[PDB]
């Protein structure tokens, strides 16, 4: 029912985004009934698998699945194997290496860790994608945290080929805890979602994996400035408010 | 008796009478001290500045150097102004979240070495937002060292909105220098700094299009102006013109990692209660000499028009007079009669204490 | 999908809803239930613990001053304990009201101590709370006479979309030359304007005062207390900045090692 | 990718790294060897990694021939367990070796997988790469890092600012209000609209004589409000919005400072701006006057009925719209279910 | 069949053939035309006072284009004697070199000179590499300029780069005014020579200034002697140390930048935080006028001076230095690997312009 699935986003808002698997898990155990639906309008945190064939480690998400197995960007086969699921366009997977190698390059100079993926599909005409980023804290105890972000671009391709319509919404999932003396422990998290849409000139010089990487770049920057110069300041504000150190 | 006013600005110190038009005069606000004749401030610091070094008392907007703020306020009262201390009240400017013992220390120097017959410290974008015609608005103030996004309602500053970039026209004139030496000319000395900040200031703008305006620049030599330099010599400036300030919306130009004057902008707007962001958005006013270049009051409105809801009235106010708004609204109200009965004498300050201002 | 189960995922929802947020993660649970006896019969004890660990304050007719509901006032019944003015009332926990407020003898005989205490700790909230409250229990706990003071303190704005929870906890026990003192500050805010974004933080404090008489042991007390409390402020403020320009850093970059943005067009041959 | 000597991975050391991430080993030494990177000496874990490190390292450190070497820690990560990746180039090797060593670093650090490394070890000597000199790398990342005297100023100006943020002064956070004096004839005006016996009030400001005085009264509905707005001058200006809220009628005033652009000099619409904070405290403070909106308008057009009661009454936050992702993979063949993992 | 690395240097050209263990010729990059066209090189130096004397490559970035081609010219067809169309070439090119700079020198090699295949590096990258390191600052200073270059895993940090044009050819030009003060005359163009060749045999780089002054002052004990090209022997001392200090103070050929130390200790702190302390301890020299006696030494106690005193800091000074640049470039041009890695006529005729940096 619609009421009710808008009650259930209503109650992920509003939920700490440390634990949405769980949260989601059990949401949907209240009302199996809206399962599906949920999912499409809420993001869960990306997963990593190992490639077998390759040795290395992909993401998981709901567009390189199909069925029950998860199909790898670097081995191009589902694991565990299909007999004949869904796989790239003859064209498109060329695209998906490259593209998959430009967003390693990318994630290397932001993160300088963590695991990449990029996964696009045909359309009716133009193409969709999606470019997923998760990586993980090592610092100590006081550096736990995570970050996970979720592109999902989808190009209108003009005919011509001379300018391209992208639009691309973006998601990040991150959370930080330090535990420091002075401090004790401190989680600080949350979820952003914004949406940028803008066509600009594509050229052999400046294929859509430039456009895109440039769209996802300046998304990703705006995102975690927009956390942590606007939420997180008015958290550190909210706290001022409530005791003072200075007597009144 | 007239009263002084003296902007203590980032890189330039403005100073001059309540009641004029524009400063009596204006010059850097650098101390130049014998590197390892006494002391040398402002013009003469950078006439010999070789055998000189120098120090910016000033340069992010806080005084950090008391004893060098000290010899600037002598040059602009006795060598600048030409007036002596004791006979004349003075106003002085404060910048954006200044501290309360900065400015009890500023009133004690006033005080107890210039012997002000009676003194006042006002903030500087809240006089220059007064100057333009409103009591609710957000202002940018771009000077020299600093840049300040400062929200007021109602006449108050919300001082958790306030933002700081430490990019102005400092960076501008430096980045500018790189640019044209990168062309194939040579500005990397002191005096050539000078001549390229005459050229930033007379040539350089900013672009609606930041890649419509290069593709253009690659097309024709529309965009291409000529300055001549003092040998007479002349040079061509193509794209570097508008290259050069676009750094205010891209730090990553001079290398550096902070956001852009619109996206600070719209920061300091949200870091403001739902309510008055309305009131915010419609009354941008800008103030400061490095918001002079042509075309980024439309720039700045395309801009936050993109960050901001589609419904939303977004409006800039340019005035013409920004590059010294902050000092002329302060000269205003130091002209005034019913004012400097406000301020405090000097007798009230010793009997009541320091803590008054 | 035991139905035994779906109230205790309900439950679950309900003690982790954020401050100030109460009735609507409630509203939602019950119209995914849609089973209100189910969740009324299912849920109490989860609507009780939620107002219990999140120190509600509410209000007495007639009564100057408001009193938290905790731990340490429960007295059964759904009845709590003001031990300011030593009654107790009927505190219902959904709409968080208060009724029939009755006189109650409290035994153990020491009331002195919690009056000492109370007085201080009440003038000391009102120097460094906009919105404080407090409340003094005074107990005998494995026959040892301990002081628990509690301090509340929250802003709720559903409209600016943010609500911001202070929860402090202050046990000493009365035990001469000298006695162990434990305090927990919590500190919670959510931020949920065009996302979502929660500041979850505690702090444990162990200090030792020295008791003596009431006068004096108060005040060391509230000093300890005091200065506690501002460190752990103060450490949170100064923690956001190091947490912005090198916690923030290790996740992702605001640029690249080479201060420069990266070319797309190069990497892509 | 800088420079890179091309030199690529013998498949030997594909399947040695495959196997290598699966924990099997200790240490793989990498050599370059004709044109090709390839394995030298691989060992298998036995005690700690603290105490394999000292014996199963140093003497492959070869004197004047550099080699990198995989040290498999105790640790782990989300990929896997956590490598030192320590690169050996003692300084008084043949050009050519420190080349080829250095220009296939990054190949090879690539090729094993970036997410797996966590410490990344450069010496020229034994002192470097020995167990001590890996325990010093690790305090000097626990050491401070070297600012600028001008980086270390803006950190002292921001620490006293955000004691200025969280501070309780606000007097300080405006300049002190003006108090020019209010005439007798514009005093009692006001006190009129007050009483409800005028509907509107028209202040306007001499600047020479320095006093605030009565411009105008005229009887002014709200269709008329528009024509009372000059298009030359600023102006103070109270009116007794009478309208219908949620069912009930008020009659409330509103305070608007109307300032129609650089028509005002710099000194009038200075003067207005300062003037305003004070004169609203005389209508508020001294008469009592319930104000219930403060309007800043530039031209009286703006002032239609909509925008009045808009004004006065808020209507509730427009949230954001939202344009719909792609369609999705075409056929997926299966419900959409959580990946979640115990 | 062989490839060749050509090193365009603000004064010298140092090319030969990949694989060699040094550039196998070595000459002055100057071209000069009369108030043929041109001589260039030795041939042009000699006719110093006839003909106008233009650097194309000033300060390590290609000014004039013409030059440019008739120095490369030189090159292949005089110094070195191959045939263009029949040999792949690995090019240096400056920091900072813009990068239609970059375009154009590859049109050259492709559409005037019809080469094969091709390659670009960065000097300060290969300088840096062939010390065995990927992330340290180099100070490469040549015939014409110098500069500071921040290099982290490869890449050059290009805000933190800095500049000075006083380098080798100054330092020559004001060891001959002091030799001049002494009362000796250094006119003829093979008397600068002559200088040249003082300079690089007997000058060497103080570890206190004054307190080597000091000692020059009241003792004979540093005053080398010199041979002249007739047999008349020259003696040289307190200029030994005063002609290279220069490098420290450019006040004396009246400069107003800083030294090398103090620009090493600015690029340093341009950088990114964390990458400083690693940068203070792989300071790798790596130019021509890097091969003063006792600047190694000097530069430790400046910068250490500079630098806070917790800080470790190391200078790496190759013996190898002086042509570090084209021996990187050998190694990597010598390479079967590397073969792939270059650019071919044929990609570069579809692709156009542009392909050089991608
Ligand atoms: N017409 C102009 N166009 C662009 N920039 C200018 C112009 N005039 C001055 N500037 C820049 O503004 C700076 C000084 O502005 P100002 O606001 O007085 O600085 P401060 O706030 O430090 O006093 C100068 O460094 C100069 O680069
Ligand atoms: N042994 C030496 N001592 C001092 N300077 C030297 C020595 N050998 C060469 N030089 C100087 O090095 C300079 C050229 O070095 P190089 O790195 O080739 O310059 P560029 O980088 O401009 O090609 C010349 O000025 C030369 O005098
Ligand atoms: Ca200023
Ligand atoms: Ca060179």
Same mark, same amino acid.
């Given at each position: 029912?619609?009421?009710?699935?808008?009650?259930?986003?209503?109650?992920?808002?509003?939920?700490?985004?440390?634990?949405?698997?769980?949260?989601?898990?059990?949401?949907?155990?209240?009302?199996?009934?809206?399962?599906?639906?949920?999912?499409?309008?809420?993001?869960?945190?990306?997963?990593?698998?190992?490639?077998?064939?390759?040795?290395?480690?992909?993401?998981?998400?709901?567009?390189?699945?199909?069925?029950?197995?998860?199909?790898?960007?670097?081995?191009?086969?589902?694991?565990?194997?299909?007999?004949?699921?869904?796989?790239?366009?003859?064209?498109?997977?060329?695209?998906?290496?490259?593209?998959?190698?430009?967003?390693?390059?990318?994630?290397?100079?932001?993160?300088?860790?963590?695991?990449?993926?990029?996964?696009?599909?045909?359309?009716?005409?133009?193409?969709?994608?999606?470019?997923?980023?998760?990586?993980?804290?090592?610092?100590?105890?006081?550096?736990?945290?995570?970050?996970?972000?979720?592109?999902?671009?989808?190009?209108?391709?003009?005919?011509?080929?001379?300018?391209?319509?992208?639009?691309?919404?973006?998601?990040?999932?991150?959370?930080?805890?330090?535990?420091?003396?002075?401090?004790?422990?401190?989680?600080?998290?949350?979820?952003?979602?914004?949406?940028?849409?803008?066509?600009?000139?594509?050229?052999?010089?400046?294929?859509?994996?430039?456009?895109?990487?440039?769209?996802?770049?300046?998304?990703?920057?705006?995102?975690?400035?927009?956390?942590?110069?606007?939420?997180?300041?008015?958290?550190?504000?909210?706290?001022?408010?409530?005791?003072?150190?200075?007597?009144? | 008796?007239?009263?002084?006013?003296?902007?203590?600005?980032?890189?330039?110190?403005?100073?001059?009478?309540?009641?004029?038009?524009?400063?009596?005069?204006?010059?850097?606000?650098?101390?130049?001290?014998?590197?390892?004749?006494?002391?040398?401030?402002?013009?003469?610091?950078?006439?010999?500045?070789?055998?000189?070094?120098?120090?910016?008392?000033?340069?992010?907007?806080?005084?950090?150097?008391?004893?060098?703020?000290?010899?600037?306020?002598?040059?602009?009262?006795?060598?600048?102004?030409?007036?002596?201390?004791?006979?004349?009240?003075?106003?002085?400017?404060?910048?954006?979240?200044?501290?309360?013992?900065?400015?009890?220390?500023?009133?004690?120097?006033?005080?107890?070495?210039?012997?002000?017959?009676?003194?006042?410290?006002?903030?500087?974008?809240?006089?220059?937002?007064?100057?333009?015609?409103?009591?609710?608005?957000?202002?940018?103030?771009?000077?020299?060292?600093?840049?300040?996004?400062?929200?007021?309602?109602?006449?108050?500053?919300?001082?958790?909105?306030?933002?700081?970039?430490?990019?102005?026209?400092?960076?501008?004139?430096?980045?500018?220098?790189?640019?044209?030496?990168?062309?194939?000319?040579?500005?990397?000395?002191?005096?050539?700094?000078?001549?390229?900040?005459?050229?930033?200031?007379?040539?350089?703008?900013?672009?609606?299009?930041?890649?419509?305006?290069?593709?253009?620049?690659?097309?024709?030599?529309?965009?291409?102006?000529?300055?001549?330099?003092?040998?007479?010599?002349?040079?061509?400036?193509?794209?570097?013109?508008?290259?050069?300030?676009?750094?205010?919306?891209?730090?990553?130009?001079?290398?550096?990692?902070?956001?852009?004057?619109?996206?600070?902008?719209?920061?300091?707007?949200?870091?403001?209660?739902?309510?008055?962001?309305?009131?915010?958005?419609?009354?941008?006013?800008?103030?400061?000499?490095?918001?002079?270049?042509?075309?980024?009051?439309?720039?700045?409105?395309?801009?936050?028009?993109?960050?901001?809801?589609?419904?939303?009235?977004?409006?800039?106010?340019?005035?013409?007079?920004?590059?010294?708004?902050?000092?002329?609204?302060?000269?205003?109200?130091?002209?005034?009669?019913?004012?400097?009965?406000?301020?405090?004498?000097?007798?009230?300050?010793?009997?009541?204490?320091?803590?008054?201002? | 999908?035991?139905?035994?189960?779906?109230?205790?995922?309900?439950?679950?929802?309900?003690?982790?809803?954020?401050?100030?947020?109460?009735?609507?993660?409630?509203?939602?649970?019950?119209?995914?239930?849609?089973?209100?006896?189910?969740?009324?019969?299912?849920?109490?004890?989860?609507?009780?613990?939620?107002?219990?660990?999140?120190?509600?304050?509410?209000?007495?007719?007639?009564? %100057?001053?408001? +009193?938290?509901?905790?731990? $340490?006032? *429960?007295?059964?019944? =759904?009845?709590?304990?003001?031990?300011?003015? #030593?009654?107790?009332?009927?505190?219902?926990?959904?709409?968080?009201?208060?009724?029939?407020?009755?006189?109650?003898?409290?035994?153990?005989?020491?009331?002195?101590?919690?009056?000492?205490?109370?007085?201080?700790?009440?003038?000391?909230?009102?120097?460094?709370?906009?919105?404080?409250?407090?409340?003094?229990?005074?107990?005998?706990?494995?026959?040892?006479?301990?002081?628990?003071?509690?301090?509340?303190?929250?802003?709720?704005?559903?409209?600016?979309?943010?609500?911001?929870?202070?929860?402090?906890?202050?046990?000493?026990?009365?035990?001469?030359?000298?006695?162990?003192?434990?305090?927990?500050?919590?500190?919670?805010?959510?931020?949920?304007? %065009?996302?979502? +974004?929660?500041?979850?933080? $505690?702090? *444990?404090?162990?200090? =030792?005062?020295?008791?003596?008489?009431?006068? #004096?042991?108060?005040?060391?007390?509230?000093?300890?207390?005091?200065?506690?409390?501002?460190?752990?402020?103060?450490?949170?403020?100064?923690?956001?900045?190091?947490?912005?320009?090198?916690?923030?850093?290790?996740?992702?970059?605001?640029?690249?090692?080479?201060?420069?943005?990266?070319?797309?067009?190069?990497?892509?041959? | 990718?800088?420079?890179?000597?091309?030199?690529?991975?013998?498949?030997?050391?594909?399947?040695?790294?495959?196997?290598?991430?699966?924990?099997?080993?200790?240490?793989?030494?990498?050599?370059?060897?004709?044109?090709?990177?390839?394995?030298?000496?691989?060992?298998?874990?036995?005690?700690?990694?603290?105490?394999?490190?000292?014996?199963?390292?140093?003497?492959?450190?070869?004197?004047?021939?550099?080699?990198?070497?995989?040290?498999?820690?105790?640790?782990?990560?989300?990929?896997?367990?956590?490598?030192?990746?320590?690169?050996?180039?003692?300084?008084?090797?043949?050009?050519?070796?420190?080349?080829?060593?250095?220009?296939?670093?990054?190949?090879?650090?690539?090729?094993?997988?970036?997410?797996?490394?966590?410490?990344?070890?450069?010496?020229?000597?034994?002192?470097?790469?020995?167990?001590?000199?890996?325990?010093?790398?690790?305090?000097?990342?626990?050491?401070?890092?070297?600012?600028?005297?001008?980086?270390?100023?803006?950190?002292?100006?921001?620490?006293?600012?955000?004691?200025?943020?969280?501070?309780?002064?606000?007097?300080?956070?405006?300049?002190?209000?003006?108090?020019?004096?209010?005439?007798?004839?514009?005093?009692?005006?006001?006190?009129?609209?007050?009483?409800?016996?005028?509907?509107?009030?028209?202040?306007?400001?001499?600047?020479?004589?320095?006093?605030?005085?009565?411009?105008?009264?005229?009887?002014?509905?709200?269709?008329?409000?528009?024509?009372?707005?000059?298009?030359?001058?600023?102006?103070?200006?109270?009116?007794?919005?009478?309208?219908?809220?949620?069912?009930?009628?008020?009659?409330?005033?509103?305070?608007?400072?109307?300032?129609?652009?650089?028509?005002?000099?710099?000194?009038?619409?200075?003067?207005?701006?300062?003037?305003?904070?004070?004169?609203?405290?005389?209508?508020?403070?001294?008469?009592?006057?319930?104000?219930?909106?403060?309007?800043?308008?530039?031209?009286?057009?703006?002032?239609?009925?909509?925008?009045?009661?808009?004004?006065?009454?808020?209507?509730?936050?427009?949230?954001?719209?939202?344009?719909?992702?792609?369609?999705?993979?075409?056929?997926?063949?299966?419900?959409?279910?959580?990946?979640?993992?115990?």
């Amino acid at each position: 029912s619609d009421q009710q699935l808008d009650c259930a986003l209503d109650l992920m808002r509003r939920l700490p985004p440390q634990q949405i698997e769980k949260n989601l898990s059990d949401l949907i155990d209240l009302v199996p009934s809206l399962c599906e639906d949920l999912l499409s309008s809420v993001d869960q945190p990306l997963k990593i698998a190992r490639d077998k064939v390759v040795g290395k480690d992909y993401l998981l998400c709901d567009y390189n699945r199909d069925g029950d197995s998860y199909r790898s960007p670097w081995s191009n086969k589902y694991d565990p194997p299909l007999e004949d699921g869904a796989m790239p366009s003859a064209r498109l997977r060329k695209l998906e290496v490259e593209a998959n190698n430009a967003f390693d390059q990318y994630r290397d100079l932001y993160f300088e860790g963590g695991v990449s993926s990029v996964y696009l599909w045909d359309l009716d005409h133009g193409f969709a994608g999606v470019i997923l980023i998760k990586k993980a804290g090592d610092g100590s105890k006081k550096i736990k945290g995570c970050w996970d972000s979720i592109h999902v671009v989808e190009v209108q391709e003009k005919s011509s080929g001379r300018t391209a319509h992208y639009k691309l919404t973006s998601t990040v999932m991150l959370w930080l805890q330090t535990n420091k003396s002075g401090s004790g422990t401190m989680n600080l998290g949350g979820s952003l979602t914004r949406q940028m849409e803008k066509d600009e000139t594509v050229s052999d010089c400046s294929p859509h994996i430039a456009n895109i990487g440039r769209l996802v770049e300046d998304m990703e920057n705006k995102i975690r400035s927009t956390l942590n110069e606007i939420y997180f300041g008015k958290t550190k504000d909210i706290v001022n408010g409530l005791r003072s150190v200075q007597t009144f | 008796t007239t009263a002084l006013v003296c902007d203590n600005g980032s890189g330039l110190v403005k100073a001059g009478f309540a009641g004029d038009d524009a400063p009596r005069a204006v010059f850097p606000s650098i101390v130049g001290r014998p590197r390892h004749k006494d002391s040398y401030v402002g013009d003469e610091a950078q006439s010999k500045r070789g055998i000189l070094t120098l120090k910016y008392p000033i340069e992010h907007g806080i005084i950090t150097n008391w004893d060098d703020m000290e010899k600037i306020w002598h040059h602009t009262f006795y060598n600048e102004l030409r007036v002596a201390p004791e006979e004349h009240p003075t106003l002085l400017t404060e910048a954006p979240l200044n501290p309360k013992a900065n400015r009890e220390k500023m009133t004690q120097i006033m005080f107890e070495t210039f012997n002000v017959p009676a003194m006042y410290v006002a903030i500087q974008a809240v006089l220059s937002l007064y100057a333009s015609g409103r009591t609710t608005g957000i202002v940018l103030d771009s000077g020299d060292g600093v840049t300040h996004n400062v929200p007021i309602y109602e006449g108050y500053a919300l001082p958790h909105a306030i933002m700081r970039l430490d990019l102005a026209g400092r960076d501008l004139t430096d980045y500018l220098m790189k640019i044209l030496t990168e062309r194939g000319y040579s500005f990397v000395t002191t005096a050539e700094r000078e001549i390229v900040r005459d050229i930033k200031e007379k040539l350089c703008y900013v672009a609606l299009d930041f890649e419509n305006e290069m593709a253009t620049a690659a097309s024709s030599s529309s965009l291409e102006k000529s300055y001549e330099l003092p040998d007479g010599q002349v040079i061509t400036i193509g794209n570097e013109r508008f290259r050069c300030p676009e750094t205010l919306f891209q730090p990553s130009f001079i290398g550096m990692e902070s956001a852009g004057i619109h996206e600070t902008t719209y920061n300091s707007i949200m870091k403001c209660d739902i309510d008055i962001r309305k009131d915010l958005y419609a009354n941008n006013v800008m103030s400061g000499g490095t918001t002079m270049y042509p075309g980024i009051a439309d720039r700045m409105q395309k801009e936050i028009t993109a960050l901001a809801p589609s419904t939303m009235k977004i409006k800039i106010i340019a005035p013409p007079e920004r590059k010294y708004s902050v000092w002329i609204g302060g000269s205003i109200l130091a002209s005034l009669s019913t004012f400097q009965q406000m301020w405090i004498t000097k007798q009230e300050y010793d009997e009541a204490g320091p803590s008054i201002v | 999908v035991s139905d035994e189960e779906k109230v205790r995922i309900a439950a679950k929802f309900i003690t982790h809803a954020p401050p100030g947020e109460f009735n609507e993660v409630f509203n939602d649970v019950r119209l995914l239930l849609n089973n209100d006896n189910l969740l009324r019969e299912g849920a109490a004890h989860a609507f009780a613990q939620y107002n219990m660990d999140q120190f509600t304050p509410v209000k007495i007719e007639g009564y %100057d001053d408001q +009193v938290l509901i905790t731990e $340490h006032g *429960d007295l059964g019944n =759904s009845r709590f304990l003001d031990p300011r003015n #030593q009654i107790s009332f009927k505190f219902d926990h959904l709409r968080k009201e208060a009724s029939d407020p009755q006189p109650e003898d409290v035994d153990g005989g020491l009331k002195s101590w919690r009056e000492s205490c109370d007085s201080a700790l009440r003038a000391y909230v009102k120097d460094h709370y906009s919105n404080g409250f407090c409340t003094v229990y005074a107990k005998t706990i494995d026959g040892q006479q301990t002081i628990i003071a509690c301090i509340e303190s929250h802003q709720f704005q559903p409209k600016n979309f943010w609500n911001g929870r202070w929860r402090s906890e202050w046990k000493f026990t009365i035990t001469p030359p000298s006695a162990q003192v434990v305090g927990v500050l919590k500190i919670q805010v959510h931020y949920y304007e %065009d996302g979502n +974004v929660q500041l979850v933080s $505690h702090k *444990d404090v162990q200090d =030792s005062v020295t008791v003596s008489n009431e006068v #004096q042991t108060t005040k060391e007390f509230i000093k300890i207390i005091e200065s506690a409390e501002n460190e752990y402020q103060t450490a949170i403020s100064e923690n956001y900045q190091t947490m912005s320009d090198t916690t923030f850093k290790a996740l992702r970059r605001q640029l690249p090692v080479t201060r420069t943005k990266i070319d797309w067009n190069k990497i892509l041959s | 990718m800088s420079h890179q000597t091309g030199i690529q991975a013998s498949e030997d050391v594909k399947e040695i790294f495959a196997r290598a991430r699966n924990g099997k080993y200790r240490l793989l030494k990498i050599s370059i060897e004709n044109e090709q990177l390839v394995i030298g000496s691989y060992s298998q874990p036995s005690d700690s990694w603290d105490k394999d490190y000292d014996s199963f390292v140093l003497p492959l450190l070869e004197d004047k021939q550099p080699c990198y070497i995989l040290f498999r820690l105790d640790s782990q990560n989300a990929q896997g367990y956590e490598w030192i990746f320590i690169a050996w180039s003692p300084d008084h090797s043949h050009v050519r070796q420190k080349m080829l060593y250095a220009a296939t670093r990054a190949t090879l650090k690539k090729e094993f997988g970036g997410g797996h490394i966590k410490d990344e070890v450069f010496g020229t000597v034994k002192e470097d790469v020995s167990l001590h000199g890996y325990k010093k790398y690790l305090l000097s990342q626990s050491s401070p890092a070297p600012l600028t005297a001008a980086e270390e100023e803006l950190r002292q100006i921001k620490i006293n600012e955000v004691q200025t943020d969280v501070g309780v002064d606000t007097k300080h956070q405006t300049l002190q209000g003006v108090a020019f004096p209010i005439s007798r004839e514009a005093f009692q005006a006001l006190e009129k609209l007050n009483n409800r016996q005028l509907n509107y009030v028209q202040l306007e400001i001499d600047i020479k004589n320095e006093i605030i005085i009565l411009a105008n009264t005229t009887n002014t509905e709200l269709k008329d409000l528009p024509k009372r707005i000059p298009k030359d001058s600023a102006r103070y200006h109270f009116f007794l919005y009478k309208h219908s809220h949620e069912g009930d009628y008020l009659e409330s005033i509103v305070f608007i400072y109307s300032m129609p652009g650089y028509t005002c000099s710099i000194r009038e619409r200075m003067l207005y701006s300062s003037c305003k904070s004070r004169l609203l405290e005389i209508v508020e403070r001294q008469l009592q006057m319930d104000v219930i909106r403060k309007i800043e308008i530039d031209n009286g057009d703006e002032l239609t009925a909509d925008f009045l009661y808009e004004e006065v009454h808020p209507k509730q936050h427009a949230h954001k719209q939202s344009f719909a992702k792609p369609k999705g993979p075409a056929g997926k063949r299966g419900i959409r279910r959580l990946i979640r993992g115990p």
